[PDB]
Design a protein around this ligand. Structure first.
Ligand code: E7O
Ligand code: E7O
Lengths: 377, 377
């Protein structure tokens, strides 16, 4: 039908209009400097997106979630992680960094900003509720798992670099409150002291055998905790979830004054997010960075494997009707911004993630419309 | 009543919440740098406020304006300008810069951003329509008159500095397209050539007798035109007015796609404007700049003379009922941002205007509520 296509275009075009206004402001008319661009982008990340997340999560009933949809979204990632573990351990070509990159490319799309409007336009509001559930699960669990993997990689690198042979003896790790992460952008001294028992205790402070799993688990937990409490999305998600539980349990309503105080800043969310994406597009040198073959492989993964694995998982679970179409089209979305931020922070194939986010945002309208049409027959 | 006070507080508090969030981000938690602050502020000025103006103006019917309200708002400024001309010409203590500053302090409040919500909360939506009419008149006429006065001052200064004695002979001025203003921040050479007729022609190019009024008028018109076409508010106001005329004449409706493309960026307007005001508050060194006595005089002017002159003009015109209260409370609003921008640009008592905007924004809630209560009896 043509009315459906017009409705999808009406929903989706203004986001691209904002994106291209930002792109032209930086590129054609030169209205903003790189520092002003960074200021706008930091405002977006700190305030606008987290408040949008609080607005969406705090309004969705957590007692009425769909269990089969959650199970399918979980089984996709379980399948991918099982395949990646098999490949990484039983194939000499395997590696942890490529496993993380493939998992992010194939499992974690942009769901909050453009997913909800696009899916509401395509299928209705209940699709918006399903996308909100997906957002909650990504924010609480899978982003946390990404933090765990990145911190484990950093800790392994530090331990190998510092204690090539003594890594088996160490039993205790002490991290001073100054340290906040193990990205490798800080000068991390590592003192070693011999205890009365004859073992070695380690203190990591800001300036091939591994230790037993217990001390590694303790260290990873400490560092994940330290990064988790400095994350605006953590507070937004947790406070929104707790408020939703209390409100839908006791039917409590927020006072109008607090609600308006939140809304006045939440209303800028979608527009400022699209503007920030346009700024990111304008700041980079080339629209394609990784290259022709690598970009082709990344796009193929994102737009075929994710949908295919989702199809297999959804058929195995027993999804049918329009839930299956929603799941597939959601899996065919462009790649999310949070994994791209993590790739920047830890420098793990950031160019592929950049190509994903930007180029897939550009080409998702035709690809997603093709999925819509083929599934709609 | 207490319900009315609660409603006004509900309408007004979230603006202050956004302002204080920006203030704390810059001052207490140090989230933004001065350059990032400038980027956010420039985004606000270029995009958010102009699109908010287009949204408000393009939706207000220009065939149903109130003529007595317009006449009262015009007569206030006519009275003030007559008094200032008398004082400036017939008193040795008079001056043009002080006349401009007093006119701005006593006539031109912040009407677009906080005036419309506050007045709608106090009196209803029709008050919002009246405030929209006031916004239109300020944007088209009085801001243009301020530009004329500032450019006349700049031209007089340039002519006196360059041609102390020959200013009477010159008959023709040529300004090269490179020049855009006469603020004094540019190195403006002034070539003089003798014509065959024996008169002197002048070319002002980027690097006590006045000339006849005709050449001065021509020069002022050229420069006012050059600054008028580089002003986002000019385009927003003119296009909104033309669209409103056409739409309310032929009942044409904008297509949903264009309307949403505008709205996605207009929705950030009020919140980003309050955030920018908070940033301006945080960036300055002292909340009071001009001093105790000068600040007292400026506040007294803003919050007593404007209301008093408006009362006299509204009684003379014949305003009664609630229109009179609306006019007085509108006159008691804090000082507008555009005259403050002009004072920055031309360096004409900018500190007094800064105190006006910021401190009056802080203290307008009690003062304006006092006006509300006293008029409400
Ligand atoms: O990665 C995502 O897109 C995502 C998915 C589900 C829930 C939240 C997010 C999320 O934080 N987005 C963003 C974070 C920071 C900056 C962003 C700028 C633009 C768009 C999304 C952003
Ligand atoms: O001066 C005013 O407040 C005004 C009055 C009527 C119509 C428009 C305006 C106006 O452009 N405001 C502003 C311009 C530029 C930046 C601003 C930032 C914050 C608030 C208002 C702003």
């Amino acid at each position: 039908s043509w009315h459906d296509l017009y409705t999808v275009l009406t929903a989706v075009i203004p986001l691209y209009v904002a994106m291209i206004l930002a792109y032209g402001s930086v590129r054609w008319w030169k209205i903003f400097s790189p520092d002003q661009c960074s200021g706008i982008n930091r405002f977006v990340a700190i305030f606008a997106v987290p408040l949008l997340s609080f607005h969406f999560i705090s309004t969705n009933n957590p007692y009425a979630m769909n269990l089969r949809f959650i199970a399918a979204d979980t089984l996709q990632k379980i399948i991918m992680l099982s395949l990646l573990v098999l490949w990484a351990n039983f194939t000499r070509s395997g590696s942890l960094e490529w496993s993380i990159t493939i998992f992010s490319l194939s499992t974690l799309p942009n769901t909050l900003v453009m997913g909800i409007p696009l899916l509401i336009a395509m299928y209705g509001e209940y699709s918006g509720s399903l996308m909100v559930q997906i957002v909650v699960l990504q924010c609480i669990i899978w982003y946390t798992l990404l933090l765990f993997l990145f911190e484990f990689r950093g800790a392994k690198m530090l331990i190998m670099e510092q204690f090539p042979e003594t890594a088996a003896s160490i039993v205790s790790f002490k991290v001073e409150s100054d340290v906040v992460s193990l990205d490798g952008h800080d000068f991390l001294e590592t003192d070693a002291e011999i205890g009365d028992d004859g073992k070695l205790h380690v203190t990591v402070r800001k300036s091939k055998n591994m230790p037993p799993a217990s001390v590694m688990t303790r260290l990873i937990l400490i560092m994940v905790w330290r990064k988790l409490i400095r994350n605006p999305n953590t507070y937004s998600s947790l406070i929104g979830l707790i408020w939703a539980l209390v409100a839908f349990r006791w039917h409590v309503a927020m006072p109008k004054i607090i609600q308006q105080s939140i809304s006045i800043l939440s209303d800028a969310g979608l527009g400022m997010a699209m503007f920030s994406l346009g700024l990111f597009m304008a700041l980079q040198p080339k629209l394609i960075a990784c290259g022709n073959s690598v970009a082709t492989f990344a796009m193929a993964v994102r737009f075929l494997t994710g949908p295919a694995v989702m199809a297999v998982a959804a058929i195995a679970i027993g999804l049918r009707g329009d839930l299956l179409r929603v799941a597939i089209v959601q899996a065919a979305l462009p790649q999310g911004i949070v994994p791209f931020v993590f790739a920047k922070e830890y420098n793990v194939h950031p160019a592929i993630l950049s190509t994903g986010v930007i180029f897939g945002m550009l080409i998702a309208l035709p690809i997603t419309l093709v999925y819509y049409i083929l599934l709609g027959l």
